[PDB]
Amino acid sequence: LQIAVGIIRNENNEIFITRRAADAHMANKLEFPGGKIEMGETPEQAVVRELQEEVGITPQHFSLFEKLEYEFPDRHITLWFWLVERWEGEPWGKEGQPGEWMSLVGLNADDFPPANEPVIAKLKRL
Ligand SMILES: Nc1nc2c([nH]c(=O)n2[C@H]2C[C@H](O)[C@@H](COP(=O)(O)O)O2)c(=O)[nH]1
Ligand SMILES: [Mn+2]
């Protein structure tokens, strides 16, 4: 299971975070909008499509900030963390999910999935 997520951050060094549903894997956890990279699709396409679907924006000139693999108690997933600094549209809860800007400095890794630990840390430096 390959996963593409977008680390969306504005000029104010804030990132746009969303909270996962109470009945989803890693429920109630904070997260970077993202989803499964589908067949016949590239990870770059997957992140654009996913952000469009989840927060209504289209990533532009983004880079791969981090790529890693994590083993959850019942599944193994590869995460593709894209740093998105330019985009069209305004990020919002397009799928009716909680969404808001969060200072990079005040992020608490414990709030996100354990898989994001290194990314969250590395983030506090760029
Ligand atoms: N969207 C998203 N999923 C994440 C993050 N970290 C992380 O482990 N995941 C995991 C949780 C899910 O098992 C999977 C995403 O699949 P869904 O979007 O279908 O929930 O990847 C993250 O920052 N964003
Ligand atoms: Mn998702």
Swiss-Prot record:
Optimum pH is 9.0. Its EC number is 3.6.1.55. Its cofactor is Mg(2+). GO terms for molecular function: 8-oxo-7,8-dihydrodeoxyguanosine triphosphate pyrophosphatase activity; 8-oxo-7,8-dihydroguanosine triphosphate pyrophosphatase activity; 8-oxo-dGDP phosphatase activity; 8-oxo-GDP phosphatase activity; magnesium ion binding; manganese ion binding. It catalyses: 8-oxo-dGTP + H2O = 8-oxo-dGMP + diphosphate + H(+); 8-oxo-GTP + H2O = 8-oxo-GMP + diphosphate + H(+); 8-oxo-dGDP + H2O = 8-oxo-dGMP + phosphate + H(+); 8-oxo-GDP + H2O = 8-oxo-GMP + phosphate + H(+). InterPro entries: Mutator_MutT, MutT-like, Nudix_hydrolase, NUDIX_hydrolase-like_dom_sf, NUDIX_hydrolase_CS, NUDIX_hydrolase_dom. One of its GO terms (biological process) is DNA repair. Keywords: DNA damage, DNA repair, DNA replication, Hydrolase, Magnesium, Metal-binding, Mutator protein. PROSITE patterns: NUDIX (PS51462), NUDIX_BOX (PS00893). A motif (Nudix box) lies at residues 35-56. Disruption phenotype: Disruption of the gene increases the rates of A:T to C:G transversion a thousandfold over the wild type level. Mg(2+) binds at G34, E54. It holds the Pfam family NUDIX. Monomer. Specifically hydrolyzes both 8-oxo-deoxyguanosine triphosphate (8-oxo-dGTP) and 8-oxo-guanosine triphosphate (8-oxo-GTP) to the related monophosphates, thereby cleaning up the nucleotide pools and preventing misincorporation of 8-oxoGua into DNA and RNA. It prevents replicational errors by removing an oxidatively damaged form of guanine (8-oxo-dGTP) from DNA and the nucleotide pool. 8-oxo-dGTP can be inserted opposite dA and dC residues of template DNA with almost equal efficiency thus leading to A.T to G.C transversions. PANTHER family: 8-OXO-DGTP DIPHOSPHATASE, NUDIX HYDROLASE FAMILY PROTEIN. Belongs to the Nudix hydrolase family. This is 8-oxo-dGTP diphosphatase. It comes from Escherichia coli (strain K12). The lineage of its organism: Bacteria, Pseudomonadati, Pseudomonadota, Gammaproteobacteria, Enterobacterales.
